[PDB]
Amino acid sequence: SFSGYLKLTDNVYIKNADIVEEAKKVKPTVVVNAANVYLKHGGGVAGALNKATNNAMQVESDDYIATNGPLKVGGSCVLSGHNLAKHCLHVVGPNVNKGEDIQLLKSAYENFNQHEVLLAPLLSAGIFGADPIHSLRVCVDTVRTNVYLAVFDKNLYDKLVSSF
Ligand SMILES: CC(C)[C@H](CO)Nc1ncnc2[nH]ccc12
């Protein structure tokens, strides 16, 4: 079902696309959200995915937090994918702008190994403040399952590919 991706490794693929638009087109088994520990989906990938669900992702997430408490940085939970995917894997990468340990980025990507194929963004990059070139390297060196990476910014996509 994935189309137009550039192969980077045996198991990692990349495309210049909004992950929301790719999810609407493909309806993958799993879409990854770039979540925070409170599952407050305000902006970046999380705010865009939640808006595409008409806020249903946020209502589900608030019930999850009321029952279970916050996630750990480096942790994840599986919730519904609503109209975008069968499931959403909410993964918390460290937020560099909040001073979180960047070594937790490898722990964050290890969550992907529980799923055979995923549509995903680069964890900890974008509004989370980490270097996206570093995030792509940790992804390729950590994830063993099949990952389709969507990168919205064209200038960044070209830099990620040309420096790989
Ligand atoms: C995470 C970051 C490197 C990347 C830079 O374009 N942001 C995104 N990538 C893919 N789909 C997106 N929708 C909303 C944001 C967003």
- Cofactors and ligands present? the ligand CC(C)[C@H](CO)Nc1ncnc2[nH]ccc12
Number of domains: 1
Level of helix content? 25-40%
CATH topology: Leucine Aminopeptidase, subunit E, domain 1
Fourth CATH level, the homologous superfamily: Leucine Aminopeptidase, subunit E, domain 1
CATH C-level name: Alpha Beta
Membrane topology: Multi-pass membrane protein
Subunit structure: May form homohexamers. Interacts with N protein.
Domain Macro: 1-164
Catalytic activity: Thiol-dependent hydrolysis of ester, thioester, amide, peptide and isopeptide bonds formed by the C-terminal Gly of ubiquitin (a 76-residue protein attached to proteins as an intracellular targeting signal)
Salient structural properties:
164 residues, alpha/beta, Leucine Aminopeptidase, subunit E, domain 1, four-stranded mixed beta sheet, three-stranded mixed beta sheet, 7 strands, 35% helix, globular, binds the ligand CC(C)[C@H](CO)Nc1ncnc2[nH]ccc12, viral protein, hydrolase, asap, AViDD, Diamond I04-1
In short:
The protein has 164 residues and is α/β, with parallel strands linked by helices. The protein has a single domain (6-161), classed as Leucine Aminopeptidase, subunit E, domain 1 (3-Layer(aba) Sandwich), CATH 3.40.220. It is 35% helix and 20% strand.
Explain the overall architecture.
This protein has a single domain (6-161), classed as Leucine Aminopeptidase, subunit E, domain 1. The strands form two sheets. A four-stranded mixed beta sheet has the order 1-2-7-6, sandwiched between helices. A three-stranded mixed beta sheet has the order 3-5-4, with helices on one face. It has helices spanning 19-26, 44-52, 56-68, 104-110, 132-142, 154-162, and strands at residues 6-7, 12-16, 30-34, 76-80, 87-91, 117-120, 146-151. By secondary structure, the protein is α/β, with parallel strands linked by helices. It is 35% helix and 20% strand. Strand 6, helix 5 and strand 7 form a beta-alpha-beta unit. Helix 4 (104-110) crosses helix 5 (132-142). The radius of gyration is 14 Å and the shape is globular. It contains six helices and seven strands; from the N terminus they run ββαβααββαβαβα. The two termini are 25 Å apart. It binds the ligand CC(C)[C@H](CO)Nc1ncnc2[nH]ccc12. The ligand CC(C)[C@H](CO)Nc1ncnc2[nH]ccc12 is lined by residues 18-20, 44-45, 48, 121-122, 125-126, 132, 150-153, 156.
